[PDB]
Ligand binder design. Structure first.
Ligand code: MG
Ligand code: ZN
Lengths: 361, 131, 38, 141
RNA sequence: AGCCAGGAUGUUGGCUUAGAAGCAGCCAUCAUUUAAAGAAAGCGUAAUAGCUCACUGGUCGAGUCGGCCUGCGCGGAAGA
């Protein structure tokens, strides 16, 4: 009896899923297609193609060979454990532990590769949550959702910084922006962008009347201080002005917002870190470009990046979550992962939806 | 390079070679190709390494300076690139017949080689010497 | 050829020449180094 | 007939032949049949350890006759196998790898001079240690 | 200063999970044989065939190579 073998059983079935993700058949089919095209006598005569054919080769060789490394590797680890239990070699028991873990460390190498983290997915990011309509019901949902995310990253260890927070009227905000410092911080949060539906009996009306509130959240990364493509001039606009009341221990003890707009395509960012006007406008233009950066990536998806124009515009990830409090049923509209624990996911038990969003993102 | 200070030490090393040696034999790499180099280096590092230095400093004031102690008749072999090679472990060894065999192997163009008169012989390659 | 008030050897093959008093700078390598005046 | 017509050096593996995938460009520009090159190394590699890095030397004659000669594995990878740590040196004497005894160096230098040339085993050991200090490898006796 | 040659074996050059047969990035910078050869001067480059400078010998066999203090000149200097 060995629970390590019970993990070898678990890792192998997961490996079948890891093979089930990448379409392991077509991986070996395409890799031989790069092989046949390099036999072509004009490899040296097509230089740019040659560096590209090697690029198509080397990118798959780090995956297909690893997939075959996990194939023949696991079969030997399947041998080294069962030989150890049936012969009682204490070192063979000790070595098989390192033999199983390294395969998971290859599964961990596939983990970031399956996540296909590119541009700024390994970097920190910013949040942007807007309140819906209907007075106090919307701002509470703005608040309760935001303060769930604030209690979320603290459990994961991501440093949180409220860049800007604009309180609506009665217990809640209308817009908020939070900087999330962390490794792969954009990677764990990118897929949460969209509109989040709240369904509950409102506490604001006598009787009952289950009310449906809406609120959206927008996650845009940190663009490495410069994208390397500055589209600055672009009808720039500064509007720096005093904010609500600095009452007692109000946010950052600043009340000095820097409202900056990007008139073409209508992008609006703002910052409320410090009293130094020149400091905030420096930080706000950083996120203005980042918000402009996510606009540039959506255009690729708008053509032929990941939409698959088959019949029509296959997408519209606006309604991505539904939070029904009085039925205790949280449903994700992108995968269908459901959970019957409201206060747990109101505390930050969102890993079940991250893996759900990791699949289609 | 330098003055007489560095110029003599190479000759003093040749003085160390004439201390117990005999039958100096020479070659001529005035035009020596890569393989004429590849032979004369890889063979020189692996044959003995001690006497197979290619001392082609054959000026009539430089190589003549090498021989005021053993066989001053070797002062005649100044011109037409000359690189001395005595034999330290074997007095009058195979390295008289060997260079002729080197010319019978790859060294076709080395047209000034004769070998010196320690045992009083020249140009004509010999084999009645203990190889 | 390049014309300047200050001419100098840009490479190792280019040499100096005083053709008809006019200081020139011929070059056996890249013709981009041919200079005049100076 | 004569010396050479097409002189190359290839094969960074010891049991993996594969004519067309990695060697394909260096076969057609050298007048080499793929399966002939695939099996000629296999005609030699069975007696030596397979999977390791062992180079080759190819000479082509004017009558299309391929004569192949193997060499010794490099210093930087064999010592990487002698130490077992797959690393180099990003920074010279900052990215350190691990120590190698002169007794470990003695078996190597005697083998590096078995397929290649040299004069002294210790002089070859200094050459290995010269490349060792060049790879960020700490060396002991 | 030319005319003739070498410019090699070294670790097929090692590491940022792109590649480097003296040359794009980061590096070293220790040798071997050493008359002497730097992982280096410029290009041919998916590291594709090579020719040369460093340094060193043979022949001719005399002076030569630069820097500085300065006299007098040249170019820079095109208008109605
Ligand atoms: Mg003047
Ligand atoms: Zn020039």
């Amino acid at each position: 009896i060995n629970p390590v073998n019970n993990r070898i059983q678990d890792l192998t079935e997961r490996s079948d899923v890891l093979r089930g993700y990448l379409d392991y058949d077509a991986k070996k089919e395409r890799l031989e297609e790069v092989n046949a095209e390099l036999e072509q006598p004009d490899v040296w005569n097509e230089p740019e193609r040659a560096q590209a054919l090697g690029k198509e080769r080397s990118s798959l060789e780090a995956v297909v060979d690893t997939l075959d490394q996990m194939k023949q590797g696991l079969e030997d680890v399947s041998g080294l454990l069962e030989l150890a239990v049936e012969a009682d070699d204490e070192e063979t028991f000790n070595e098989a532990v390192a033999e199983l873990d390294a395969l998971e460390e290859k599964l961990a190498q596939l983990e970031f590769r399956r996540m296909f983290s590119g541009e700024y997915d390994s970097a920190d990011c910013y949040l942007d949550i807007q309140a819906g309509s209907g007075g106090t019901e919307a701002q509470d949902w703005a608040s309760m959702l935001e303060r769930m995310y604030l209690r979320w990253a603290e459990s994961r260890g991501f440093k949180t910084e409220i860049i800007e927070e604009s309180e609506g009227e009665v217990a809640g905000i209308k817009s908020v922006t939070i900087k999330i410092s962390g490794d792969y911080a954009y990677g764990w949060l990118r897929t949460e962008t969209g509109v989040h539906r709240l369904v509950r009996k409102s506490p604001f009306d006598s009787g009952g009347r289950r009310h449906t509130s809406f609120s959206s959240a927008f996650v845009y990364p940190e663009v490495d201080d410069d994208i390397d493509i500055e589209i600055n001039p672009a009808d720039l606009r500064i509007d720096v002005y005093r904010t609500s009341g600095a009452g007692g221990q109000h946010v950052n003890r600043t009340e000095s917002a820097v409202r900056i707009t990007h008139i073409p395509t209508g992008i609006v960012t703002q910052c409320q870190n410090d009293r130094s006007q020149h400091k905030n406008k420096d930080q706000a233009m950083k996120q203005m470009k980042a918000k402009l950066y996510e606009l540039e990536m959506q255009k690729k998806n708008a053509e032929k990046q990941a939409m698959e124009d088959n019949k029509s515009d296959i997408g519209w990830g606006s309604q991505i979550r539904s939070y029904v409090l009085d039925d205790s049923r949280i449903k994700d509209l992108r995968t269908g992962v459901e959970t019957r624990n409201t206060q747990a996911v109101l505390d930050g038990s969102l890993d079940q939806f991250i893996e759900a969003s990791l699949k289609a993102g | 390079m330098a003055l007489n200070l560095q110029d003599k030490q190479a000759i003093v090393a040749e003085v160390s070679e004439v201390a117990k040696g005999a039958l100096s034999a020479v070659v001529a790499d005035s035009r020596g190709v890569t393989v004429d180099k590849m032979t004369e280096l890889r063979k020189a590092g692996r044959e003995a390494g001690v006497y197979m230095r290619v001392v082609r400093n054959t000026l009539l004031r430089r190589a003549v300076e090498g021989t005021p102690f053993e066989c001053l008749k070797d002062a005649f072999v100044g011109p037409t690139l000359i690189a001395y090679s005595m034999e330290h472990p074997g007095a009058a060894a195979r390295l008289f017949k060997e260079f002729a065999k080197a010319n019978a192997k790859f060294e076709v163009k080395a047209a000034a080689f004769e070998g010196e008169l320690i045992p009083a012989s020249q140009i004509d390659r010999l084999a009645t010497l203990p190889t | 050829m390049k014309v300047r008030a200050s001419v100098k050897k840009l490479c190792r093959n280019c040499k100096i020449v005083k053709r008809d008093g006019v200081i020139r700078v011929i070059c056996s390598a890249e013709p981009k180094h041919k200079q005049r005046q100076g | 007939a004569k010396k050479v017509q097409a002189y190359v050096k290839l094969q960074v593996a010891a049991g993996m032949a594969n004519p067309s995938p990695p060697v394909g460009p260096a076969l057609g520009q050298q007048g080499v049949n793929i399966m002939e090159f695939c099996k000629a190394f296999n005609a030699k590699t069975d007696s030596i350890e397979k999977g390791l890095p062992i180079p080759v030397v190819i000479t082509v004659y004017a009558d299309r006759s391929f004569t192949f000669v193997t060499k010794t594995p490099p210093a930087a990878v064999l010592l990487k196998k002698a130490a077992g740590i797959k690393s180099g040196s990003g920074k010279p004497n900052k990215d350190k790898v691990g120590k190698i005894s002169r007794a470990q160096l003695q078996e190597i230098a005697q083998t590096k001079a078995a397929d290649m040339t040299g004069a002294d085993i210790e002089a070859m050991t200094r050459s290995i240690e010269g490349t060792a200090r060049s790879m960020g490898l700490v060396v002991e006796d």
